A paper describes a structure:
Here, we show that the NatR–NatT TA system, which is part of the core genome of the human pathogen Pseudomonas aeruginosa, generates drug-tolerant persisters by specifically depleting nicotinamide dinucleotides. We show that NatT is an NAD phosphorylase, which leads to the depletion of both NAD and NADP in a subpopulation of cells. NatT function is tightly controlled by NatR, which is both an anti-toxin and an auxiliary factor required for toxin stability.
Ectopic expression of natTE29D, a mutant isolated in a screen for increased tolerance in P. aeruginosa, showed stronger interference with growth and strongly increased survival during exposure to tobramycin or ciprofloxacin. Thus, the E29D mutation boosts toxin-associated phenotypes, suggesting that it unleashes NatT activity. To explore the NatT activation mechanism, we next solved the structure of NatTE29D in complex with NatR. Structural differences between wild-type and mutant proteins were limited to subtle changes in the NatR’-NatT interface close to residue E29. A water molecule bridging the phosphate positioned in the NatR’-NatT interface with residues T70 and R73 of NatT wild-type was missing in the E29D mutant. Moreover, the E29D substitution changes its interaction with R119 of NatR’, forcing the neighboring E26 to adopt a different rotameric configuration, which in turn disrupts the interaction with the main chain of the C-terminal helix α7 of NatR’. Thus, the activating mutation E29D may not only disturb the interaction between the Flap and helix α7, but may also disrupt NatT dimerization. Importantly, the NatR–NatTE29D complex showed a single peak at 60 kDa, indicating that the TA complex is in a dynamic equilibrium between an inert hexameric state and a smaller, active subcomplex and that this transition mediates NatT toxin activation. In agreement with this, purified NatR–NatT wild-type complex (4R:2T) readily bound to the natR–natT promoter region, while a purified NatTE29D complex failed to bind the same DNA fragment.
Residue numbers in the entry:
A (entry chain A), D (entry chain D): -5 to 122
B (entry chain B): 7 to 122
C (entry chain E): 7 to 119
E (entry chain F), F (entry chain C): 2 to 251
The structure:
Amino acid sequence: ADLNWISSALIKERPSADAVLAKAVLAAREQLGLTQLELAGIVGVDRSAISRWKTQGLRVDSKTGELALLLVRVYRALYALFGGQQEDMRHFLRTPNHHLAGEPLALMGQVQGLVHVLEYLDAIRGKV
Amino acid sequence: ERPSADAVLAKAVLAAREQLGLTQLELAGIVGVDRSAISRWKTQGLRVDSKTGELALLLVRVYRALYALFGGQQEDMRHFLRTPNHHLAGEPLALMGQVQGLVHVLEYLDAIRGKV
Amino acid sequence: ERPSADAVLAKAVLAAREQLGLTQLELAGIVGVDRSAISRWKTQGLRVDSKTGELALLLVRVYRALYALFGGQQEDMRHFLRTPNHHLAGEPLALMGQVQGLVHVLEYLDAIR
Amino acid sequence: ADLNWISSALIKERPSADAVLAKAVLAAREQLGLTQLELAGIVGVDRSAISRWKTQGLRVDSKTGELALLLVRVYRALYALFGGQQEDMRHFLRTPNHHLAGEPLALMGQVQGLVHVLEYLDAIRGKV
Amino acid sequence: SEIWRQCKGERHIRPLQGRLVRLVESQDQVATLQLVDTLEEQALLEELLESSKPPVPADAEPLHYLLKTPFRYPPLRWGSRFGRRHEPSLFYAALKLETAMAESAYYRCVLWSGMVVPPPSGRILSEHASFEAGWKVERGIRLQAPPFSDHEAALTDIADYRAPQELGSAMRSAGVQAFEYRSARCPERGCNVALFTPAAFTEKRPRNLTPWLCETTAGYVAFKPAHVPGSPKIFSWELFLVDGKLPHPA
Amino acid sequence: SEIWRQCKGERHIRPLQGRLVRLVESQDQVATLQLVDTLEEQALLEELLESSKPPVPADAEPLHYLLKTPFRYPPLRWGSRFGRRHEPSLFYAALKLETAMAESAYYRCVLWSGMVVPPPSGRILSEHASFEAGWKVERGIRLQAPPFSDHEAALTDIADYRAPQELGSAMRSAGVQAFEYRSARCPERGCNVALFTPAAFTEKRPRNLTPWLCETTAGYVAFKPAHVPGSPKIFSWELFLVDGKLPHPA
C-alpha cells in the first residue's frame, strides 16, 4: 500500500554475508571466552587474518568460513542447552568430558574433533 | 631431497586423487584450496599442521576405507563415490564437499567394515 | 490541643467508618493497621505522611464521591459498597480491601460524576 | 507407579509463602537498582524491618505484603517489556515519563503512583 | 453517542463470526524465575501475585488463561479506543496477523516515546507469542461497512478516542457483544475486532500459539519467528509518526 | 536381528496410527541474535549456518521445519536406541507428554553427567517447546505387545543398544515405516514411537506448540509451562540412576 511502502521501502537495508559471518564468530569467540589463538586453532587462521575480518569479511564460500559456521553452531547449541548461561557454556568447553573422551575445546582444535563436539551437542538437542 | 611430513602428505593425497577420478576442482572443494597450491603441492608439499592438511588426511582415510571395502577395484571405488546412496542422504562425493559430510562419509565406510 | 494534620485525617476516616457501616476489621484491611492502632487515632492522630495515611486519604476520598453521588443518603451509599457490581468485577468494599482495588473504586466513582 | 512417587517424595520442597515473598522483593530491589530506603518508601516500612525479611519472611496478607507484590509485578512487567535488559528496566524507573507525568520510581513512593505505574505497564502488555 | 444515533445503531445489529489473532507477552514466568531459587518457589510466587491483580470477571473465569487475561486488566488511563478506564475492558485483536503486528508495533513505540530520554540500549530484544481463536456473537456490528463507515475517519483518528469511546458505551448498553472495526495503525487498511463479553469465543483453546522475536529501536519495530527460519517483518516509526511526534490521547 | 527372526516380524507388520509428542529446543534463534546487531542480519546468519548442516533427506524437505529437523541430524556416537550413527536417523517421540518429559529429563542428565566436573551454576534454567502431531503408516510394528514383548527387557536395556539397534536395521530392511516401543526411562512405563520415513505424518503443521520452562540441577529435572500458571513436574535423577552413575552405552 501507499505508506505500507514508505517505510518498508524505508527499512530494507541489505547486509553482506561475509560481514555478518565475521561479526558473528568474533562475538561467539568472546562470549565463549576464547583467546584469539584458540579461535585461530579452530578455523585455521593466524591472528593477522582475524584483524582483517573487519575490513573485508570472512568469506563464507571459503573453507575457513565453513569451520566458522561450525564454531558458531557450537555456540548456538551450547547457548540453547545451557539456557544462555555463559559460565556453564565456557565450563563445558574447558572441562574434560566423559562422552567426548577429552576436553571439548581441545578437540575443536582439529577438524574431526570439532565435528564430534558439534554432533554431540546436535544430538542432545532433538532429544530435549 | 630428504623426507619430510609435508611431502609425505602431498604424495599420499594425490595418489588418492588419481585412483578416484577426482578433478582438480573436486579435490579443491574437499580440502579448501584453489588450484593455486595444487600444483605447488608436488614441489613444496602440503602443510600437515594446517586445516587443509586435516582435510587432506581425512580424504586419504576415505580412500583407504574404500580400498579395503572394494578390494582395490577402482571401478568399484569410483562407482560408490558418484552413485547416490540411500543410507547417506546424497552421493558420497557431494557430501564430502562440506566438512561435516567429509567426516560423515569416512565414518560410514568404517562402519561397513566395522563388522566384516 | 491545637490543630494538626494527624488529628484531622484519623478523624475524617472514623467519620467515614460509619455512614458507611464499616466494622473495625473491614477498615483495618483498607488502611493496613491492626484494630489497636484504630482507637489510638482519636487522641494520638493518624500520621498523614505515613503509608497508612496515604491509604486513609484515599478512603475518605471514596466516601465523598459516594456522598456527592448519592446526595448524602446512607441507605444507598452503604448499598453500593456491599452490593456486587459488574462494572467492577466484584463488590466495591471487597475491592477496597486491596490496594489496586481501592484506587480502582475511587477512579470509578470520580468518573460517575 | 511408585518409582516416580517415591522419587518425587524424596525430592519435593514445600516453600514458605512469606519466605518466598521476602526473597523475591529483595531480589527485585537489587535487579532494579533500588536502595533500601527507596524500597522502604514503596512498601511503607523502614530499613529495620527490611533486614527482618531474611530470617522471618514477609507476611503476604499484611498490607506491607500487598505493596511488595505490586512492586514485584512492576519488575515483572518491566522485564517482559524490556526483554530482561536490566539497564533498560532501571532506566524506565529513573527517567521522567511523558505518559505518567513524572519519574516512575518517584511516583511509586506513594500508593496511587505505584498503582498508576503498574496499570500503565500492565496496559502496554496485552497490546503487545 | 451521536453516531450510534445517526448511524442506525440497533437495526444494524447482526450475528457475526470470524477468527482473531493477537500478540501477547511471553516472558512473564521467566521474569519471576530470576527473583527465586526453584520452579516450585516460582509457581508459589506467581500465585501470590495473582491475589493482588484486579479480579477476573465472573463469566471469564472458566476461560483459558490467555483468553481471559485481557478482561481483568484495565486499559491505559486515557482508555482504549472503544472503552474507558472506568468501564469493563474489551478483548482487542485483529482479523489478520499483519494487522496485529502493526497494532503491537505501534504500542512498542508508545512505551519507547513515553520516556523523555530514549532507552540507553537503543535496541530492545523482546520475545512475544501469537495465537488464533474463533469467535461468534449473536449481536454484532461492523464499523467498516454501512453508515458507520461515513464516520470511519473519526473512529480511526490517530490521537483521540472520544467519538469511538462514546460509541463503545452506546454499543455496550445496546447489548452488542462484539464488533469489527478498521484499524487506525495498520498500513494495509486491515480490520480489527473487539469483544465485550467472554462468551464470544467458540473454542476455549488458543490455537496456533507461535513464538516471535521482536527488535525495537528508535527507527523501526521488527518481528520474526523464534522457532522456525524466516525473514523479519519490519514496521518503521513513520507508519505511525505525525510530524516528528508519536500520536496518542494525552 | 535375532529378535526379528525369532518373532517372525514380517508376519506381524500391520497398519498403525496415533498421535505423537516430543520436546525440542526453543532458544536457537535467541542464541544467534546475541552474535548480531539486527534481525535482518540474524536471518541471514541462520541461513549461512544452514548451508553447513547435514543435508535434508529428499523426502523430508517439504515438511515443516520442526517435523523434518530430526531427520537431518545424526544421533550420538553410540547411536540411538533403534538406529546407529551410520544409518538414517529416526524421528523419536512419545505417545504421552509425561513420557516425552521423562525421556527429555534423562537426556538433560546425560549432558550434565558428561562433564567430569558438574556445571558450576548448579542450576540451568532452559526453555523448551512441545508439539503434537498425527502419524499413520501402512506398515507398522508394535514392539510392546505380541512376540516382541518376550524380548521387551532386552529392548528396554538402560545402557545397551546392540539388540534394539540390530532390530532397527532388520525392521528398516523389512520395509517398516514406523513402530511403537516401550520407553526405557519413563517411570510410568509409557511407550514411545519412532518413524523411519517422513511420509508417516498426516498433518502440515506441528500442533499444540507449548512453551516450557525447565530447571536442571544435580538432583532433579523440572518442567512447567512458560505461558500459563502451573505447578512444576519433577523428574528426579533417581528415576534414571543405577548405583550412583547415569547409565548409557559407552
